[PDB]
Amino acid sequence: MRIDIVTIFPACLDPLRQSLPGKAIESGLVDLNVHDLRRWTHDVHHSVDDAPYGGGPGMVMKAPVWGEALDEICSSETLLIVPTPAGVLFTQATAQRWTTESHLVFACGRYEGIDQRVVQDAARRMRVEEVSIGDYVLPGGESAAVVMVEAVLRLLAGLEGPSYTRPASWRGLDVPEVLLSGDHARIAAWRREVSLQRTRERRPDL
Amino acid sequence: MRIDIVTIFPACLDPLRQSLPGKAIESGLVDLNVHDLRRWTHDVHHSVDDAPYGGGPGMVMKAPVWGEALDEICSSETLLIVPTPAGVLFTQATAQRWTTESHLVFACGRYEGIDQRVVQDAARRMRVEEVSIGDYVLPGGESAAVVMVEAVLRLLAGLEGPSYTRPASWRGLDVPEVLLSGDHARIAAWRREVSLQRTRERRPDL
Ligand SMILES: NC1CCN(Cc2ccc(CNC(=O)c3csc4nc[nH]c(=O)c34)cc2)CC1
Ligand SMILES: NC1CCN(Cc2ccc(CNC(=O)c3csc4nc[nH]c(=O)c34)cc2)CC1
């Protein structure tokens, strides 16, 4: 797989060079590229942002600088991923289907976001997905991109109940006797019950 | 605020030293500490994991090594955050209330997770929260911790419709005329409509 990440903060994607994402690149399975958006600016200040039309707080990421960036990087086979709090939610279903792609481009937005037309224009030649990682507000799209990339890369290099290891008794807390029984069907029966219960208390919607 | 992050991958928390999270530490508003869990191991191999009781795939993070780590770092006033796919969902409501804390500890889990007793024992002296960032599977809790910390740190240093900046016309795509009208009540009326519509198409549950 080929992954290109476009951002004003390349260093924010350095965890992708560590642990399993790093093992995926070193195995030669994934080719990761992280680009500074400012490499496509031609002004003396390397401005990527500007004042929003219709006013409002914050700044808006310039469409022509992004347009130039994505014009060189993308092709008609590219899946352009635009992380945004306005997108559809990222799930494991999304991670699983992204493993069937040869080229993923992550257009990481800063300030108030990216000029909407970048997405409309890109959709003329390639598929585009606007995706949120959850119901919370982040200052940028780089942390979201790390999350999405390691979840895809986890499958590439191929509610949960509680886990216990040695010792059997620790600080007055004993490992449930059932996990020391040797009855594999009984162990499975318990794990289902505890998971089902944990699911009702924390995520009844699931 | 004081933030301590315990992990087997300290480098995975380096984006917190960049952008706004970095501005929060440099402003002296937040004191960030990232610890290697292996600094609390006494064996020759610095083993943090071991085989699970009742069997099953993968390894389980040892409770005594974590117990020793959290014993030194935490106090009775500490809010211990255990990122896990078994936790309650992280939202903006959670980020907003975490801004009222003086000490947050992030116990980042690897392998199949942390021995459940670490959480049960810690809950004897301090408050504990098991939290998931979404309906997807990650190889570790460090990316989740970056997400949660920048969302809290964003508020500390204090669906959305589309955004547009200069030029008015780009690649045959014009900025909606309404944003060039000068009628602030009309601009607000439109922004509500487009957001409400985007919300119905992507997040009707919201
Ligand atoms: N007081 C208001 C709060 C919301 N602001 C909008 C806004 C704009 C840009 C962002 C940046 N978001 C991301 O890059 C992002 C990218 S993926 C993602 N998933 C969940 N939440 C997220 O914030 C993100 C967040 C919020 C406007 C001012
Ligand atoms: N084939 C099975 C797939 C699930 N595995 C369980 C498992 C254990 C540990 C993790 C690690 N998760 C996190 O550290 C985590 C921490 S916060 C979070 N939020 C959403 N999703 C997440 O995975 C996380 C993920 C899945 C068992 C094998």
Coordinates of C-alpha atoms and ligand atoms in Angstrom, one line a residue:
Chain A
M1 CA 0.0 0.0 0.0
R2 CA 1.1 3.6 -0.6
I3 CA 0.2 6.3 2.0
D4 CA 0.8 10.0 1.5
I5 CA 0.0 12.4 4.4
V6 CA -0.2 16.2 3.6
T7 CA 0.1 18.5 6.6
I8 CA 1.6 21.8 8.0
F9 CA 3.0 19.5 10.9
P10 CA 5.0 16.5 9.5
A11 CA 6.5 15.7 12.9
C12 CA 2.9 15.0 14.2
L13 CA 3.0 11.8 12.0
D14 CA 6.3 10.5 13.6
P15 CA 4.5 7.7 15.7
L16 CA 3.8 6.0 12.4
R17 CA 7.6 5.2 12.2
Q18 CA 7.4 3.5 15.6
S19 CA 5.8 0.1 16.7
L20 CA 3.6 -1.9 14.3
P21 CA 3.1 0.9 11.7
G22 CA 6.9 1.1 11.5
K23 CA 7.1 -2.8 11.2
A24 CA 4.6 -2.5 8.2
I25 CA 6.9 0.1 6.4
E26 CA 10.1 -1.9 7.2
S27 CA 8.5 -5.1 6.0
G28 CA 8.1 -3.2 2.7
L29 CA 4.3 -3.8 2.8
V30 CA 3.5 -0.1 3.1
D31 CA 5.3 3.0 1.6
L32 CA 4.6 6.0 3.9
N33 CA 5.2 9.5 2.7
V34 CA 4.6 12.6 4.9
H35 CA 4.6 16.0 3.1
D36 CA 4.7 19.6 4.3
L37 CA 1.8 21.6 2.6
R38 CA 4.2 24.7 2.6
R39 CA 6.3 22.9 -0.1
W40 CA 3.5 23.9 -2.6
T41 CA 3.3 27.6 -1.5
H42 CA 5.1 30.2 -3.7
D43 CA 4.7 33.3 -1.4
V44 CA 7.5 34.8 0.9
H45 CA 5.5 33.9 4.1
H46 CA 4.4 30.4 2.8
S47 CA 0.7 31.3 3.7
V48 CA -1.6 28.3 3.7
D49 CA -4.5 30.1 5.4
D50 CA -6.7 33.2 4.8
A51 CA -9.8 35.0 6.2
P52 CA -13.2 33.2 5.8
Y53 CA -15.9 34.4 3.4
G54 CA -19.0 35.5 5.3
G55 CA -16.8 36.2 8.2
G56 CA -16.6 34.1 11.4
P57 CA -13.8 33.1 13.8
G58 CA -10.4 31.5 12.8
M59 CA -8.8 31.1 9.4
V60 CA -9.6 28.9 6.4
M61 CA -7.0 26.7 4.5
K62 CA -6.5 28.1 1.0
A63 CA -7.9 25.9 -1.8
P64 CA -5.2 26.7 -4.5
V65 CA -2.2 25.6 -2.3
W66 CA -4.1 22.3 -1.5
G67 CA -5.2 22.0 -5.1
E68 CA -1.6 22.1 -6.3
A69 CA -0.5 19.7 -3.5
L70 CA -3.2 17.0 -4.3
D71 CA -2.7 17.5 -8.2
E72 CA 0.8 16.1 -7.9
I73 CA 0.2 13.4 -5.3
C74 CA -3.1 12.0 -6.4
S75 CA -4.3 9.9 -9.4
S76 CA -7.8 8.5 -10.4
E77 CA -7.2 5.4 -8.3
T78 CA -6.5 7.4 -5.1
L79 CA -8.8 7.3 -2.1
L80 CA -8.5 10.9 -0.7
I81 CA -9.3 10.9 3.1
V82 CA -10.1 14.4 4.5
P83 CA -10.2 14.1 8.4
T84 CA -12.9 16.6 9.7
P85 CA -15.4 16.8 12.6
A86 CA -18.0 17.2 9.8
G87 CA -17.3 13.7 8.3
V88 CA -18.9 10.3 8.7
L89 CA -17.6 8.3 11.7
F90 CA -14.6 6.1 11.3
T91 CA -15.3 2.5 12.3
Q92 CA -13.5 -0.9 12.0
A93 CA -15.7 -1.5 8.9
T94 CA -14.0 1.5 7.3
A95 CA -10.5 0.3 8.4
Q96 CA -11.2 -3.2 6.9
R97 CA -12.3 -1.9 3.5
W98 CA -9.4 0.6 3.3
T99 CA -7.0 -2.5 3.2
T100 CA -8.3 -3.1 -0.4
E101 CA -6.6 0.2 -1.6
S102 CA -3.2 0.8 -3.3
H103 CA -3.1 4.6 -2.6
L104 CA -4.5 6.5 0.4
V105 CA -3.9 10.3 0.6
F106 CA -4.6 12.0 4.0
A107 CA -5.3 15.7 3.7
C108 CA -4.8 16.8 7.3
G109 CA -6.6 20.2 8.0
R110 CA -5.6 22.9 10.4
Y111 CA -7.1 26.4 11.4
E112 CA -11.0 26.2 10.8
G113 CA -10.5 23.5 8.1
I114 CA -10.0 23.2 4.3
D115 CA -11.9 25.2 1.7
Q116 CA -14.9 22.9 0.7
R117 CA -14.1 23.3 -3.0
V118 CA -10.8 21.2 -2.7
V119 CA -13.1 18.2 -1.9
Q120 CA -15.6 19.1 -4.7
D121 CA -12.8 19.5 -7.3
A122 CA -10.9 16.3 -6.2
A123 CA -14.2 14.3 -6.5
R124 CA -14.1 15.0 -10.3
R125 CA -11.1 12.6 -10.8
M126 CA -11.0 10.4 -7.6
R127 CA -13.1 9.1 -4.7
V128 CA -13.2 11.3 -1.5
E129 CA -14.2 10.5 2.1
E130 CA -14.7 13.1 4.8
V131 CA -14.2 11.2 8.1
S132 CA -14.4 12.0 11.8
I133 CA -12.8 9.8 14.5
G134 CA -15.4 10.8 17.2
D135 CA -17.7 13.2 19.0
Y136 CA -14.9 15.5 20.3
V137 CA -13.0 18.5 19.0
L138 CA -9.3 18.3 18.1
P139 CA -7.0 21.2 17.0
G140 CA -5.9 19.4 13.8
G141 CA -6.3 16.3 11.6
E142 CA -2.9 14.7 12.2
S143 CA -3.8 12.8 15.4
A144 CA -6.9 11.5 13.6
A145 CA -4.7 10.4 10.6
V146 CA -2.3 8.5 13.0
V147 CA -5.4 6.6 14.5
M148 CA -6.9 5.7 11.1
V149 CA -3.5 4.6 9.6
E150 CA -2.5 2.3 12.5
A151 CA -6.0 0.7 12.5
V152 CA -5.6 0.0 8.7
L153 CA -1.9 -1.0 9.2
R154 CA -2.9 -3.4 12.1
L155 CA -5.1 -5.4 9.7
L156 CA -2.4 -5.1 6.9
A157 CA 0.3 -6.9 9.2
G158 CA -2.2 -9.7 10.1
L159 CA -17.0 -5.0 24.2
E160 CA -13.9 -7.0 25.0
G161 CA -14.1 -8.7 28.4
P162 CA -11.4 -8.4 31.1
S163 CA -7.8 -9.9 30.9
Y164 CA -5.7 -11.5 33.6
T165 CA -2.1 -12.8 33.8
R166 CA 0.3 -14.0 36.6
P167 CA 0.1 -14.0 39.7
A168 CA -3.2 -15.8 40.5
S169 CA -3.5 -13.5 43.6
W170 CA -2.4 -9.9 43.6
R171 CA -3.0 -7.2 46.3
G172 CA -6.0 -9.2 47.6
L173 CA -7.4 -9.5 44.1
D174 CA -7.7 -13.1 42.7
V175 CA -8.0 -14.1 39.1
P176 CA -11.6 -15.4 38.6
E177 CA -11.5 -19.2 39.5
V178 CA -13.1 -20.1 36.1
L179 CA -9.9 -19.0 34.2
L180 CA -8.0 -21.6 36.4
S181 CA -10.6 -24.4 35.7
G182 CA -9.2 -25.9 32.4
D183 CA -12.7 -26.1 31.0
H184 CA -12.4 -24.3 27.6
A185 CA -16.2 -24.3 27.0
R186 CA -16.8 -23.0 30.5
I187 CA -14.1 -20.3 30.1
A188 CA -15.8 -19.2 26.7
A189 CA -19.3 -19.2 28.4
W190 CA -18.0 -16.8 31.1
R191 CA -16.1 -14.5 28.7
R192 CA -19.3 -14.0 26.7
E193 CA -21.3 -13.2 29.9
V194 CA -18.8 -10.6 31.2
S195 CA -18.5 -9.0 27.7
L196 CA -22.3 -8.9 27.3
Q197 CA -22.7 -7.3 30.8
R198 CA -19.8 -4.8 30.2
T199 CA -21.5 -4.0 26.8
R200 CA -24.9 -3.2 28.6
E201 CA -23.3 -1.0 31.3
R202 CA -21.1 1.0 29.0
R203 CA -22.4 0.7 25.4
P204 CA -26.2 -0.5 25.4
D205 CA -26.5 1.0 21.8
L206 CA -24.0 -1.8 20.7
Chain B
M1 CA -2.4 20.8 34.9
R2 CA 0.0 17.8 35.4
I3 CA -0.1 15.0 32.8
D4 CA 1.8 11.7 33.1
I5 CA 1.7 9.2 30.3
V6 CA 2.9 5.6 31.1
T7 CA 3.8 3.5 28.0
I8 CA 6.3 1.0 26.4
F9 CA 6.5 3.5 23.4
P10 CA 7.4 7.0 24.8
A11 CA 8.3 8.3 21.2
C12 CA 4.5 7.7 20.2
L13 CA 3.7 10.8 22.5
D14 CA 6.1 13.1 20.7
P15 CA 3.3 15.0 18.7
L16 CA 2.3 16.4 22.2
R17 CA 5.6 18.5 22.0
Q18 CA 4.4 20.0 18.6
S19 CA 1.7 22.6 17.7
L20 CA -0.9 23.7 20.4
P21 CA -0.2 20.9 22.9
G22 CA 3.5 22.1 22.8
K23 CA 2.3 25.8 23.2
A24 CA 0.4 24.7 26.3
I25 CA 3.5 23.1 27.9
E26 CA 5.8 26.1 26.9
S27 CA 3.2 28.6 28.3
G28 CA 3.8 26.7 31.6
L29 CA 0.1 25.9 31.8
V30 CA 0.6 22.1 31.5
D31 CA 3.5 19.9 32.8
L32 CA 3.7 16.9 30.5
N33 CA 5.7 13.7 31.6
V34 CA 6.0 10.6 29.4
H35 CA 7.4 7.5 31.2
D36 CA 8.7 4.2 29.9
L37 CA 6.9 1.3 31.8
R38 CA 10.1 -0.7 31.6
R39 CA 11.8 1.7 34.1
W40 CA 9.6 -0.2 36.8
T41 CA 10.8 -3.7 35.7
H42 CA 13.5 -5.5 37.7
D43 CA 14.1 -8.6 35.4
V44 CA 17.0 -9.0 32.8
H45 CA 14.5 -8.9 29.9
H46 CA 12.4 -6.0 31.2
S47 CA 9.2 -8.2 30.6
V48 CA 6.0 -6.2 30.9
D49 CA 3.7 -9.0 29.4
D50 CA 2.9 -12.6 30.1
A51 CA 0.5 -15.5 29.0
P52 CA -3.2 -14.9 29.7
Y53 CA -5.1 -17.0 32.3
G54 CA -7.8 -19.2 30.7
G55 CA -5.7 -19.1 27.5
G56 CA -6.5 -17.1 24.4
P57 CA -4.5 -15.2 21.7
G58 CA -1.8 -12.5 22.5
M59 CA -0.2 -11.5 25.8
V60 CA -1.4 -9.6 28.9
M61 CA 0.4 -6.7 30.5
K62 CA 1.6 -7.7 34.0
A63 CA -0.3 -6.2 36.9
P64 CA 2.8 -5.9 39.4
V65 CA 4.9 -3.8 37.0
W66 CA 1.9 -1.4 36.4
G67 CA 1.1 -1.5 40.1
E68 CA 4.6 -0.3 40.9
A69 CA 4.5 2.4 38.1
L70 CA 1.1 3.9 39.2
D71 CA 2.1 3.6 43.0
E72 CA 4.9 6.2 42.5
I73 CA 3.1 8.5 39.9
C74 CA -0.5 8.6 41.3
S75 CA -2.1 10.2 44.4
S76 CA -5.7 10.2 45.8
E77 CA -6.5 13.3 43.7
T78 CA -5.3 11.7 40.4
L79 CA -7.7 10.9 37.6
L80 CA -6.3 7.6 36.1
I81 CA -7.3 7.3 32.4
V82 CA -7.0 3.7 31.0
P83 CA -7.5 3.9 27.2
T84 CA -9.2 0.6 26.0
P85 CA -11.7 -0.6 23.3
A86 CA -13.8 -1.8 26.4
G87 CA -14.2 1.7 27.8
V88 CA -17.0 4.3 27.7
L89 CA -16.7 6.5 24.6
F90 CA -14.7 9.8 24.7
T91 CA -16.7 12.9 23.8
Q92 CA -16.3 16.7 24.0
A93 CA -18.3 16.5 27.3
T94 CA -15.4 14.3 28.8
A95 CA -12.7 16.7 27.4
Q96 CA -14.5 19.7 29.0
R97 CA -14.8 18.1 32.4
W98 CA -11.1 16.9 32.4
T99 CA -10.0 20.6 32.3
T100 CA -11.1 20.8 36.0
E101 CA -8.3 18.3 37.0
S102 CA -4.8 19.0 38.4
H103 CA -3.4 15.5 37.7
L104 CA -4.2 13.1 34.8
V105 CA -2.4 9.8 34.4
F106 CA -2.7 7.9 31.1
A107 CA -2.0 4.2 31.4
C108 CA -1.4 3.3 27.7
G109 CA -1.9 -0.5 27.2
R110 CA -0.2 -2.7 24.6
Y111 CA -0.5 -6.5 23.7
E112 CA -4.1 -7.7 24.6
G113 CA -4.4 -5.0 27.3
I114 CA -3.7 -4.4 31.0
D115 CA -4.5 -7.0 33.8
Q116 CA -8.0 -5.9 35.0
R117 CA -6.9 -5.9 38.7
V118 CA -4.6 -2.8 38.1
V119 CA -7.9 -0.8 37.6
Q120 CA -9.7 -2.5 40.6
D121 CA -6.7 -1.8 42.9
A122 CA -6.2 1.8 41.7
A123 CA -9.9 2.5 42.3
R124 CA -9.2 1.9 46.1
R125 CA -7.3 5.3 46.3
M126 CA -8.2 7.3 43.2
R127 CA -10.9 7.7 40.5
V128 CA -10.4 5.6 37.3
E129 CA -12.0 5.9 33.9
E130 CA -11.7 3.2 31.1
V131 CA -12.2 5.2 27.8
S132 CA -12.5 4.3 24.1
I133 CA -11.9 6.9 21.3
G134 CA -14.2 5.0 18.9
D135 CA -15.7 1.9 17.2
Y136 CA -12.4 0.7 15.7
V137 CA -9.4 -1.4 16.8
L138 CA -5.9 0.1 17.4
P139 CA -2.6 -1.7 18.2
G140 CA -2.1 0.4 21.3
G141 CA -3.4 3.2 23.6
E142 CA -0.8 5.9 22.7
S143 CA -2.6 7.3 19.6
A144 CA -5.8 7.4 21.7
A145 CA -3.9 9.3 24.5
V146 CA -2.6 11.9 22.0
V147 CA -6.2 12.5 20.8
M148 CA -7.6 12.8 24.3
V149 CA -4.7 15.1 25.5
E150 CA -4.9 17.6 22.6
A151 CA -8.7 17.8 22.9
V152 CA -8.3 18.7 26.7
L153 CA -5.3 21.0 25.9
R154 CA -7.3 22.7 23.1
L155 CA -9.8 24.0 25.8
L156 CA -7.0 24.7 28.3
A157 CA -5.4 27.2 25.8
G158 CA -8.7 29.0 25.2
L159 CA -22.0 19.0 12.3
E160 CA -19.9 22.0 11.3
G161 CA -20.9 23.5 7.9
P162 CA -18.5 24.2 5.0
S163 CA -15.7 26.8 4.9
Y164 CA -14.5 29.0 2.0
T165 CA -11.7 31.6 1.6
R166 CA -10.1 33.5 -1.4
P167 CA -10.6 33.3 -4.4
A168 CA -14.4 33.8 -5.0
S169 CA -14.1 31.5 -8.1
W170 CA -11.7 28.5 -8.2
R171 CA -11.6 25.7 -10.9
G172 CA -15.2 26.5 -11.9
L173 CA -16.3 26.4 -8.3
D174 CA -17.8 29.6 -6.9
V175 CA -18.1 30.5 -3.1
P176 CA -21.9 30.5 -2.4
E177 CA -23.2 34.0 -3.2
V178 CA -24.8 34.3 0.3
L179 CA -21.2 34.5 1.9
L180 CA -20.6 37.5 -0.4
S181 CA -23.9 39.3 0.6
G182 CA -22.9 41.2 3.8
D183 CA -26.1 40.2 5.5
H184 CA -24.9 38.6 8.8
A185 CA -28.4 37.3 9.7
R186 CA -28.8 35.8 6.2
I187 CA -25.2 34.2 6.4
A188 CA -26.1 32.7 9.9
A189 CA -29.5 31.4 8.5
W190 CA -27.7 29.6 5.6
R191 CA -24.9 28.1 7.8
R192 CA -27.6 26.6 10.1
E193 CA -29.4 25.0 7.0
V194 CA -26.2 23.5 5.5
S195 CA -25.1 22.2 8.9
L196 CA -28.6 20.7 9.7
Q197 CA -28.6 19.0 6.2
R198 CA -25.0 17.7 6.5
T199 CA -26.0 16.4 10.0
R200 CA -29.1 14.5 8.5
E201 CA -27.0 12.9 5.6
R202 CA -24.0 11.9 7.8
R203 CA -25.1 11.8 11.5
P204 CA -29.0 11.5 11.8
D205 CA -28.4 10.1 15.4
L206 CA -27.1 13.6 16.3
Ligands
LIG1 N1 -16.0 27.0 19.0 C1 -16.1 26.3 17.7 C2 -15.6 24.8 17.9 C3 -15.6 24.0 16.6 N2 -14.7 24.7 15.6 C4 -14.7 24.0 14.3 C5 -13.6 23.1 14.1 C6 -12.8 23.2 12.9 C7 -11.7 22.3 12.7 C8 -11.5 21.3 13.6 C9 -10.4 20.4 13.3 N3 -10.8 18.9 13.4 C10 -10.1 17.9 12.8 O1 -9.1 18.1 12.1 C11 -10.6 16.6 12.9 C12 -10.1 15.8 11.9 S1 -10.8 14.3 12.2 C13 -11.6 14.7 13.5 N4 -12.4 13.9 14.2 C14 -13.1 14.4 15.4 N5 -12.9 15.6 15.7 C15 -12.1 16.5 14.9 O2 -12.0 17.6 15.4 C16 -11.4 16.0 13.8 C17 -12.3 21.1 14.7 C18 -13.3 22.0 14.9 C19 -15.2 26.1 15.3 C20 -15.2 26.9 16.6
LIG2 N1 -9.1 -10.4 16.9 C1 -9.4 -9.7 18.1 C2 -9.5 -8.2 17.9 C3 -9.6 -7.4 19.3 N2 -8.5 -7.7 20.2 C4 -8.6 -7.0 21.5 C5 -7.9 -5.8 21.6 C6 -7.0 -5.6 22.7 C7 -6.3 -4.4 22.8 C8 -6.5 -3.3 22.0 C9 -5.8 -2.1 22.1 N3 -6.7 -0.9 22.2 C10 -6.4 0.3 22.7 O1 -5.4 0.5 23.3 C11 -7.3 1.3 22.7 C12 -7.1 2.3 23.6 S1 -8.3 3.4 23.4 C13 -9.0 2.7 22.1 N4 -10.1 3.2 21.5 C14 -10.7 2.5 20.4 N5 -10.1 1.4 20.1 C15 -8.9 0.9 20.8 O2 -8.5 -0.2 20.3 C16 -8.4 1.6 21.8 C17 -7.4 -3.5 20.9 C18 -8.1 -4.7 20.8 C19 -8.4 -9.2 20.5 C20 -8.3 -10.0 19.2

